Amino acid sequence: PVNPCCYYPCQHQGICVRFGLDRYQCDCTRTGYSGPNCTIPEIWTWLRTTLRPSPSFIHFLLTHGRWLWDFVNATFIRDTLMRLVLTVRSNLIPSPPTYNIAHDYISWESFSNVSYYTRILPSVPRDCPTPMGTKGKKQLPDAEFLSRRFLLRRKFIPDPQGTNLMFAFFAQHFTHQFFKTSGKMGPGFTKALGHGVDLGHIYGDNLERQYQLRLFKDGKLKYQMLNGEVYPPSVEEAPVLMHYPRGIPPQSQMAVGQEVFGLLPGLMLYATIWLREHNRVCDLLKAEHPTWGDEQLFQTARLILIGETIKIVIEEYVQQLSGYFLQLKFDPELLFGAQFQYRNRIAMEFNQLYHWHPLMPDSFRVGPQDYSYEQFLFNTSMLVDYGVEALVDAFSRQPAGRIGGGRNIDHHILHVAVDVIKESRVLRLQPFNEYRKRFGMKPYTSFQELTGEKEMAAELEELYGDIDALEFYPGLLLEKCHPNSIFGESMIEMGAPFSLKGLLGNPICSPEYWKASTFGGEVGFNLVKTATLKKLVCLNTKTCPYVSFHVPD
Amino acid sequence: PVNPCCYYPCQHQGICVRFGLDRYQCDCTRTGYSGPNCTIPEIWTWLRTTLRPSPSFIHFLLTHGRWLWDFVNATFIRDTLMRLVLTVRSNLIPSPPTYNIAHDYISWESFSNVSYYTRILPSVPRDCPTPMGTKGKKQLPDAEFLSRRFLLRRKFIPDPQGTNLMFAFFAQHFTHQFFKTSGKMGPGFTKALGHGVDLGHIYGDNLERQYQLRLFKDGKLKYQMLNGEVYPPSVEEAPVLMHYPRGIPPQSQMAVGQEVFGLLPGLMLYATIWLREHNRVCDLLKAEHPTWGDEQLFQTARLILIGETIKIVIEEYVQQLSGYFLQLKFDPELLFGAQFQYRNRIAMEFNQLYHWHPLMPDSFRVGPQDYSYEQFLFNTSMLVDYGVEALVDAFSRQPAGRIGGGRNIDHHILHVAVDVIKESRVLRLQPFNEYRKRFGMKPYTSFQELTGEKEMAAELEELYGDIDALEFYPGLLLEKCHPNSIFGESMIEMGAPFSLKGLLGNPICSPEYWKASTFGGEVGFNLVKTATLKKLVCLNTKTCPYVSFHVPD
Ligand SMILES: *[C@@H]1O[C@H](CO)[C@@H](O[C@H]2O[C@H](CO)[C@@H](O[C@@H]3O[C@H](CO[C@H]4O[C@H](CO[C@H]5O[C@H](CO)[C@@H](O)[C@H](O)[C@@H]5O)[C@@H](O)[C@H](O)[C@@H]4O)[C@@H](O)[C@H](O)[C@@H]3O)[C@H](O)[C@H]2NC(C)=O)[C@H](O)[C@H]1NC(C)=O
Ligand SMILES: *[C@@H]1O[C@H](CO)[C@@H](O[C@H]2O[C@H](CO)[C@@H](O[C@@H]3O[C@H](CO[C@@H]4O[C@H](CO)[C@@H](O)[C@H](O)[C@@H]4O)[C@@H](O)[C@H](O)[C@@H]3O)[C@H](O)[C@H]2NC(C)=O)[C@H](O)[C@H]1NC(C)=O
Ligand code: HEM
Ligand code: HEM
Ligand SMILES: *[C@@H]1O[C@H](CO)[C@@H](O[C@@H]2O[C@H](CO)[C@@H](O)[C@H](O)[C@H]2NC(C)=O)[C@H](O)[C@H]1NC(C)=O
Ligand SMILES: *[C@@H]1O[C@H](CO)[C@@H](O[C@H]2O[C@H](CO)[C@@H](O)[C@H](O)[C@H]2NC(C)=O)[C@H](O)[C@H]1NC(C)=O
Ligand SMILES: *[C@@H]1O[C@H](CO)[C@@H](O[C@H]2O[C@H](CO)[C@@H](O)[C@H](O)[C@H]2NC(C)=O)[C@H](O)[C@H]1NC(C)=O
Ligand SMILES: *[C@H]1O[C@H](CO)[C@@H](O[C@@H]2O[C@H](CO)[C@@H](O)[C@H](O)[C@H]2NC(C)=O)[C@H](O)[C@H]1NC(C)=O
Ligand SMILES: CCCCCCCCO[C@@H]1O[C@H](CO)[C@@H](O)[C@H](O)[C@H]1O
Ligand SMILES: CCCCCCCCO[C@@H]1O[C@H](CO)[C@@H](O)[C@H](O)[C@H]1O
Ligand SMILES: CCCCCCCCO[C@@H]1O[C@H](CO)[C@@H](O)[C@H](O)[C@H]1O
Ligand SMILES: CCCCCCCCO[C@@H]1O[C@H](CO)[C@@H](O)[C@H](O)[C@H]1O
User: Fold this and answer.
1) How many domains does the structure of chain B reveal?
2) A395 and A266 in a common domain
3) Residue B289 to residue A18, Cβ atoms within 8 A
4) Contact between residue A246 and residue A203 where contact means Cβ atoms under 8 Å apart
5) Catalytic residue among B33, B223, B231, B354
6) Which end of chain A, N or C, is less packed with Cβ atoms under 10 Å?
7) B50 with B17, same domain?
8) Pairwise CA distance, residues A46 & A44, whole Å
């Protein structure tokens, strides 16, 4: 007998529970719907659904008018809308968390065991006819071919939003504090136990590592002086596990929070910035607190850095990414009147979603010099001899790639795209159309409606068979891209929920934490509130170069 | 220079931060108060404080006039009040949590490291003149002598509320799932990482141990059958670490979630009840879902037993303890309106508070037979000799001892009381009156006001010197009891916040979790809703004896 939940019979966040031998029922409490499958709307929701404009109309409003939005930003409407954005986006995520790789149901282990990644949609059951549920062919398309035919870059398609490499390396550095898929436990498991903006990519995911990175004097982290400039210390000085090529001198090796940051100079660049920030913050804290011990100077400085990160992400990072004329604002006080759970669990969906690999260009330009992938990768010297200020200027000037649209990931890093598609099948993720339903969108009727283009659509028809068989990661990477945007609509409608939930779901945003005491007084509290990417770099360097998430134009 | 925060200058929930050499500044954010010390009230606070009745007046209303409460319990006023009972009690607790034994401030480590017990008040700083801060003598009164002169039982004083040993054992059994002080790590640390009603005393504090208890067929835990009755398995079948005295046979040894439970027949009794219940629930779940594997059958059965506990504890356990004429009601939907955090962390002060050793009698009576402490303690044969039925009847008829008042903890277990006081000083807990202010009460002006008694109050002043120097634990047990009640006001006013926060703060009480599907449909969802102490026993036994938290009368 065929498993009923393979058809995904229930709508609007309803739960498919199997009863008896071949039967099923659906629990649709607080979904706003009624019925056996739950399609009958309630008084309130029927009014809510007919007076709702499409996600296209909202995107059109936020990205048009210059004009209307200049007024909104200069008034209280700015805060009224920001509260609404935070409210409506975050509700689309289970909190407390629901499912994981092992359990397609709510359990105590799924709540307690933080080594698991979270899961919004249940897995595609192993007793389903097709691998994507009910619709499609017996064997899924080849992971290698799809990447080679639809993802592989041929011509460099730049980002129309003016995104630079400086963003890319930030989008990698920042993202790697909550995405740490373990090689030991395998897919669906994480090492980054902080599950968000904890800075376990600066201080480390465990305490043993943290104590090694610390100088134990003035609350500062260890450092080495190269060319009269502050850099992360050598492994010979602070012995921690770092993924470096075998044979590299211990002096050249640099010790940081995240063990992967050594492989790219861009990652080690940001690791240098935050380090240089942490220590100078300790200097400002010791100025008004001479009685404070080493522990307090350290722990308070961390929270300031956590607060600065979220400020810079919300107000500057996401701002560039969204392309809104609405001036996004980091103010936790906005959620003080509403019901919000101050916790977050990192989902595998978000992991799969955040594989923005098409940012990485064909080469890496540093001023008059041009560097290849074989030259740029694993380079240990490049960080030091160029310096921070000269290297930041280089990444802030070079244009980054277009994420959406397709055919825009370099061949050197193409081996990651296939792993994502292969790992998705191991996770048994539901088809793209089912993930659109969950995030308040309409499922695509055809492959034509997905891409808008004709040629690439016909080839996807023949491979997948049905549109309801299309996979999660290819769907996002091949969705039609509205002329002057970085990616398709689904990326925003799915990404923003996870993003905003994790950024505001931080405990420092809660009423009990969001106060001057937590940050050692007014001085620390203002540092959190007035932080910008420009002040993160230039206040730490010697000369202030060009620094933004957009190219100079 | 003397540390300014030793005087406790910051009134109400105001945070004392130290600035410069000999200065301090006080952070009165969201406390309702203004000024350098948090003493100038806002419009609303000034209104609220004048219209607010004293806690002793409200207790009088809740424990008098049966006629008025008969009208309230049969109407929605029962819900309106119960919601208010939940909201205003839980609001007195920081969530996300604040301090621990290592940090007198807010830090990420304090939020992240689950091994720590929490603090509501920060510790008495190490650089204060007296050990209690500013007032009292240079050396605190002898811990061993305090316990012998004021706490030691002489004549048996039973509880006037008619509390039986059946309650007392439940109290101990239930409470030891979140109280697990690590001997390896020391005081201020816990092994119960679940922090609340997770049933880590039934399934274990870790996953490696959990699996050892599980049968892995039909979601049931392992069990052995003696005399025809179901009992927890032997260590020979389920090899888990337990604190049995060296020399005991592996057959008479019985394996459960909590390692200490093998020491007392009362603790091992309840362990058998919840064992039979879990396996009983698995039978009913298998009936509805034949397709379910072992894991889903187990995980759901755990959640149902989690719900059953939170029902019994509120509607019967706390009902008996409080003696309120208002019928307490467990409905998570009451908190669906206001702002609530579904997150809990056990405080070290909650640990000190729950040490209700006066509950235990001079001897243990089982029908026409009487068992001394030497006989009752550590017996393995005892619970199997009489069975569950006879033992349940026995403890339900014997009266427990009054916790408050004084002189009611038996000499056999008196050594614990000494350790609690000794540990308090290691944890450096703030004086009793400072804990009173924090829980919305007035500090005691003298020792006479605390006791309502002449002789023992006079010696207390001779031992301590100042009332503001009285310690947390002795202050709770040596407080004037209201006539007919089980303990003094302070234990209600401090305990109930911790108790109701840990019960309703459980993720199963959240909108995401509190669904029919979570408990495998209607059958499991009603089991949670119709859970009583009587049902927990009668359904799992052949014959049902007297079952209640109070003596028959
Ligand atoms: C978060 O979640 C993850 C995954 O759930 C978890 O990771 C670990 O999970 C398990 C359990 O700890 C680890 O171990 C694996 O499980 C098997 C068990 O299978 C067999 O076990 C029995 C054999 O052991 C014992 O046998 C005799 C008696 O039978 C006994 O006397 C001996 O002492 C002996 O130990 C056997 O009876 C049974 O029939 C099974 O065949 C282990 O054998 C082995 O170790 C497995 O690897 C995993 O390694 C962990 N990783 C993963 C990826 O699963 C985390 O622990 C959890 N985190 C937290 C904080 O809880
Ligand atoms: C919960 O959080 C607890 C915070 O106290 C953790 O405490 C435990 O781990 C600590 C470190 O792993 C222990 O602290 C000590 O640190 C000193 C300092 O030396 C430092 O360690 C290096 C290796 O030993 C040295 O090379 C280097 O010099 C460095 O400065 C060390 O001498 C001690 O040996 C010890 O490591 C601490 O003792 C320990 N227990 C307690 C009770 O504090 C827990 O790790 C954490 N628990 C869990 C379950 O996550
Ligand atoms: C040229 C630089 C890049 C290289 C060499 C690279 C390569 C890799 C490799 C080999 C892995 C798997 C290793 C592992 O973590 O187990 C990985 C993971 C990942 N990458 Fe990249 N990639 C690059 C660019 C980027 C960028 C710019 C982003 C930012 C969006 C990104 C996002 C991610 C994410 C989110 C993961 C998963 C992390 C985890 O769960 O462990 N990658 N990358
Ligand atoms: C005769 C039966 C009892 C015995 C033999 C007993 C014995 C003990 C002992 C030896 C300790 C360790 C204290 C220490 O660190 O020195 C302890 C802890 C404790 N007891 Fe009891 N006790 C009994 C009854 C009770 C009762 C009725 C309660 C009420 C709930 C209770 C509550 C507690 C609590 C809350 C702890 C602290 C747990 C921890 O943090 O480790 N006990 N008990
Ligand atoms: C690592 O980066 C450094 C840049 O500091 C590279 O050194 C440069 O190499 C180019 C040729 O590719 C020379 O023209 C420059 O004069 C070099 N600059 C300096 C300051 O030495 C180095 O080649 C890179 N490493 C690898 C392995 O490619
Ligand atoms: C509930 O879900 C099922 C499955 O998706 C829907 O379709 C089923 O029921 C119909 C009854 O008339 C049959 O015609 C279909 O063949 C049958 N299909 C499957 C795959 O089971 C059904 O329409 C939904 N019910 C409602 C009221 O919308
Ligand atoms: C706030 O509280 C402080 C400490 O409890 C009060 O005490 C201060 O003033 C006293 C004289 O009235 C001095 O003798 C104390 O030493 C001094 N404390 C310190 C740390 O300097 C103080 O009165 C209160 N503040 C105000 C403005 O009244
Ligand atoms: C533990 O208690 C049990 C009760 O079951 C004791 O066993 C009984 O002891 C009583 C004495 O009051 C006698 O009537 C019986 O002979 C015993 N019954 C059996 C079946 O042996 C036991 O002695 C106690 N253990 C200790 C160490 O004192
Ligand atoms: C009418 C005033 C415009 C305010 C814009 C609010 C932005 C909220 O964004 C909304 O998020 C929801 C959940 O992700 C989606 O269902 C909506 O399509 C989307 O517009
Ligand atoms: C007529 C009875 C009114 C019942 C409503 C009061 C129940 C709310 O509980 C209240 O919590 C407060 C804060 O912890 C305490 O100060 C009060 O003593 C307590 O009554
Ligand atoms: C509004 C109800 C009117 C009844 C008058 C009520 C008398 C309340 O008087 C109460 O007596 C108690 C004695 O146990 C004290 O604990 C309280 O402090 C006191 O307020
Ligand atoms: C220091 C703790 C103060 C908490 C007091 C909270 C009092 C609740 O305030 C009440 O809330 C109601 C909604 O439930 C509103 O209808 C009332 O207008 C409002 O007075």
Assistant:
1) 2
2) yes
3) yes
4) no
5) B354
6) C
7) no
8) 6
Q: Are residues B26 and B65 in the same domain?
A: no
Please provide the size of chain A in residues: 553
Looking at the fold, whether A28 and A154 belong to one and the same domain comes out as no
For residue A249 the two structure tokens come to: 């001198």
Rounded-to-integer distance, Cα A290 and Cα B23, Å: 11
Of B103, B176, B201, B550, the active-site residue reads: B176
CA A547 from centroid of its chain's CA atoms: 21
Q: How far apart are CA A415 and CA A436, in angstroms?
A: 27
Residues A499 and A449 in one domain: yes
Strands B364-366 and B369-371 come out as antiparallel
| B16 and B99 co-located in one domain | no
Ligand nearest to the CA of B112: 2
Asked if the bond preceding A160 is cis, omega within 30° of 0, the reply is no
Cis preceding linkage at B96, omega within 30: yes
> CA separation (Å) from A256 to A140, A226, A419, B394?
41, 16, 27, 63
On the CB side of A22, how many CA atoms lie within 13 Å of its CA?
2
Closest C-alpha to B259, from B204, B213, B308: B204
Q: Which residue has the tokens 């009601």?
A: B329
Please provide the distance, in angstroms rounded to a whole number, between the alpha carbons at the two ends of chain A.
63
SS3 letters for B1-32? CCCHHHCCCCCCCCEEEEECCCEEEEECCCCC
Closest residue by Cα to residue B496 from B317, B281, B289, B336: B317
Query: Which residue numbers of A are catalytic?
Result: 176, 354
- E-state strands within A141-236: 224-226, 229-231
Technique employed here was X-ray
Domain CATH code at residue A38:
2.10.25.10
> Does the distance separating the beta carbons of B303 and A107 come in below 8 Å?
yes
Q: How buried is B102 (Cβ within 10 angstroms: 0-12 exposed, 13-18 middle, 19+ buried)?
A: middle
Q: Which CATH number do you get for residue B380?
A: 1.10.640.10
What is the rounded distance in angstroms from the CA atom of residue A278 to the CA atom of residue A309? 12
The length of chain B is 553
Nearest C-alpha neighbor of B436 from the set B467, B398, B403: B467
Distance CA B414, CA B149 (A): 11
B24 and B111 fall within a common domain: no
Phi, psi values for residue A164, rounded to 5° = -105, 175
DSSP structure string for A217-276:
STTPBP-EEETTEEEPPPTTTS-------TT--TTT----SSTTTTS-HHHHHHHHHHHH
Give the domain extent around B19. 2-42
Query: Residue A438 C-alpha to ligand 9 middle, in angstroms?
Result: 14
User: Would residue B354 show up in a list of annotated catalytic residues for this protein?
Assistant: yes
Same domain, A165 and A27: no
Q: Please name the residue whose Cα sits nearest to atom 4 of ligand 6.
A: A9
Phi, psi torsion values for B50, nearest 5 degrees: -80, -35
Q: Which atom of ligand 6 approaches the CA of A39 most closely?
A: 28
